[PDB]
Amino acid sequence: FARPCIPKSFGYSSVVCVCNATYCDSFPALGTFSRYESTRSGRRMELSMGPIQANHTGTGLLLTLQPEQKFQKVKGFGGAMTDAAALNILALSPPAQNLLLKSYFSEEGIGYNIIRVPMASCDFSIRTYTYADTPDDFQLHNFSLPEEDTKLKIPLIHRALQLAQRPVSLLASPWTSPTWLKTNGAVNGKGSLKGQPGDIYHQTWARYFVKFLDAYAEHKLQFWAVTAENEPSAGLLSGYPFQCLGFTPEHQRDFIARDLGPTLANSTHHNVRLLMLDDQRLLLPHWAKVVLTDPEAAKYVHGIAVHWYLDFLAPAKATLGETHRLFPNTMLFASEACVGSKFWEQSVRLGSWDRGMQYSHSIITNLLYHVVGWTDWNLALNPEGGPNWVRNFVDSPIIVDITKDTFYKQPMFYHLGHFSKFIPEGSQRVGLVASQKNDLDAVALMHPDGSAVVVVLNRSSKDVPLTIKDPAVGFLETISPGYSIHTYLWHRQ
Numbered sequence: 196f197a198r199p200c201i202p203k204s205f206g207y208s209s210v211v212c213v214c215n216a217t218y219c220d221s222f223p224a225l226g227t228f229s230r231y232e233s234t235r236s237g238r239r240m241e242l243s244m245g246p247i248q249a250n251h252t253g254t255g256l257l258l259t260l261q262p263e264q265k266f267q268k269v270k271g272f273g274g275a276m277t278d279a280a281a282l283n284i285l286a287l288s289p290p291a292q293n294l295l296l297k298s299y300f301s302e303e304g305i306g307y308n309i310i311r312v313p314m315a316s317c318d319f320s321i322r323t324y325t326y327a328d329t330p331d332d333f334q335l336h337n338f339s340l341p342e343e344d345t346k347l348k349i350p351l352i353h354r355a356l357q358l359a360q361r362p363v364s365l366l367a368s369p370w371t372s373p374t375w376l377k378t379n380g381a382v383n384g385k386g387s388l389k390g391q392p393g394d395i396y397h398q399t400w401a402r403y404f405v406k407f408l409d410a411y412a413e414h415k416l417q418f419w420a421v422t423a424e425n426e427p428s429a430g431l432l433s434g435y436p437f438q439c440l441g442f443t444p445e446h447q448r449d450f451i452a453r454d455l456g457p458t459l460a461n462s463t464h465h466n467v468r469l470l471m472l473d474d475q476r477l478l479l480p481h482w483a484k485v486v487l488t489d490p491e492a493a494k495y496v497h498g499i500a501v502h503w504y505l506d507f508l509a510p511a512k513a514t515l516g517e518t519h520r521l522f523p524n525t526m527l528f529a530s531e532a533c534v535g536s537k538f539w540e541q542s543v544r545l546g547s548w549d550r551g552m553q554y555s556h557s558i559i560t561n562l563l564y565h566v567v568g569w570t571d572w573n574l575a576l577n578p579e580g581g582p583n584w585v586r587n588f589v590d591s592p593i594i595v596d597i598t599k600d601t602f603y604k605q606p607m608f609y610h611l612g613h614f615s616k617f618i619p620e621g622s623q624r625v626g627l628v629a630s631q632k633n634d635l636d637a638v639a640l641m642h643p644d645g646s647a648v649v650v651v652l653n654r655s656s657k658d659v660p661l662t663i664k665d666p667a668v669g670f671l672e673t674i675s676p677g678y679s680i681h682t683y684l685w686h687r688q
């Protein structure tokens with residue numbers, strides 16, 4: 196049954212939806228379309244229908260589908276299961292925990308199909324650890340998963356998979372290696388692996404990845420992909436305040452070529468995809484050129500992961516678009532995003548419409564430039580945006596209010612849902628052209644069954660009447676209200 200949003204305002208531009216132990220909000224014909232609408236004024240994925248008409252006339256804005264122009268296939272959408280997300284979720288009563296996970300992972304919720312999992316601690320942990328902290332354990336004999344994995348992350352990831360109808364892909368990323376493998380002997384700061392790729396430090400580090408995949412397999416979890424390192428550029432930066440491990444693109448190239456690729460290929464986990472970069476898109480296309488023009492590294496790289504944080508410095512055509520033109524067979528994937536990280540921003544703005552529009556504007560732009568997936572950061576945080584051992588607080592689509600056993604679903608959650616619920620793995624992006632200049636962001640995709648989905652974000656405050664033309668089925672006449680977001684679905688059969 197469709198239970199509606201319980202709105203609550205916290206003084207910002209829109210409302211959150213209040214969920215608790217007993218209550219959370221939840222969820223065509225032919226010649227007919229469905230519309231799902233979310234507005235700043237408070238509408239939350241509201242369903243409505245309309246006719247696909249045969250003829251159309253007028254000089255209004257027209258968006259024409261080009262279903263014969265086929266682009267990338269979609270891997271999917273989801274978020275990260277950090278220690279911080281696990282702690283917050285486990286601090287609710289079990290019925291409330293089930294409503295939180297169902298929100299994300301079930302068909303009654305928004306159908307996430309990706310989960311990013313940090314390999315040992317990052318800033319969103321309450322302590323500083325790796326899986327092999329015993330000094331000079333080159334053998335990795337004292338390699339083990341702490342309670343953070345065995346009592347927190349793993350059981351939650353299981354509950355998620357149990358609630359999913361869609362098959363879920365796990366993605367793993369390390370922030371730092373054991374400190375005895377690092378030039379600087381610390382989890383943070385400027386510092387990289389000692390020595391040079393091909394050597395004992397590097398074979399050990401590669402072996403750790405396999406050790407990690409082995410331990411997760413023992414608990415019956417398998418990975419779709421790993422990244423070669425979270426934000427390699429970080430550890431190049433003097434003073435870096437939290438867990439990091441620096442690689443120049445050359446160093447990453449040679450690590451993948453001589454150590455990490457071979458070690459994964461020779462393992463039971465040879466089907467695991469390796470993704471490179473896992474950093475700002477401004478580093479593209481340079482990094483892809485350095486890594487992929489080496490045939491010894493190229494043969495191990497399935498794809499390129501990007502983070503959104505310096506987007507403003509890096510227009511998508513010159514970065515994502517140029518990477519696709521040079522390397523069309525190496526998928527681009529967005530693996531981390533969050534709002535509220537800028538020193539001047541308040542970490543959590545409960546009910547922020549603006550932050551929701553940032554998510555959807557990013558997903559659309561990324562999809563228009565060949566990106567196959569998009570992953571949020573922390574699945575849930577507290578009202579302060581934590582916890583986080585260095586107070587690097589940020590926002591999250593779900594905020595958990597522990598002392599009240601309630602959690603808030605923010606507009607980011609819905610802007611995300613507009614994609615994740617209606618764009619399953621295997622969907623494919625198709626062309627869409629606009630009849631004239633406009634302030635909308637729009638993308639069209641084809642489901643595996645051939646049915647259409649179109650998402651329209653209105654970045655301006657003015658209501659925009661428009662028409663969507665599907666070349667051999669008809670016309671959808673609709674209105675896109677100011678600031679709103681719409682998903683349209685229709686069968687082309």
Ligand SMILES: *[C@@H]1O[C@H](CO)[C@@H](O[C@@H]2O[C@H](CO)[C@@H](O[C@H]3O[C@H](CO)[C@@H](O)[C@H](O)[C@@H]3O)[C@H](O)[C@H]2NC(C)=O)[C@H](O[C@@H]2O[C@@H](C)[C@@H](O)[C@@H](O)[C@@H]2O)[C@H]1NC(C)=O
Nearest residue numbers: 198199200201202213214215216217218219220599600601
């Ligand atoms: C979990 O959240 C739910 C939904 O928000 C809480 O229950 C709801 O409780 C509200 C008010 O407590 C209730 O309200 C209306 O009717 C009033 C009289 O006509 C009117 O003046 C008022 O403003 C409300 O519009 C609403 O009907 C109800 N929602 C549903 C569908 O249940 C729930 O609360 C607690 O559990 C039940 C038994 C509830 O009715 C309260 O009496 C309880 O204290 C939340 N749980 C907790 C722990 O807060």
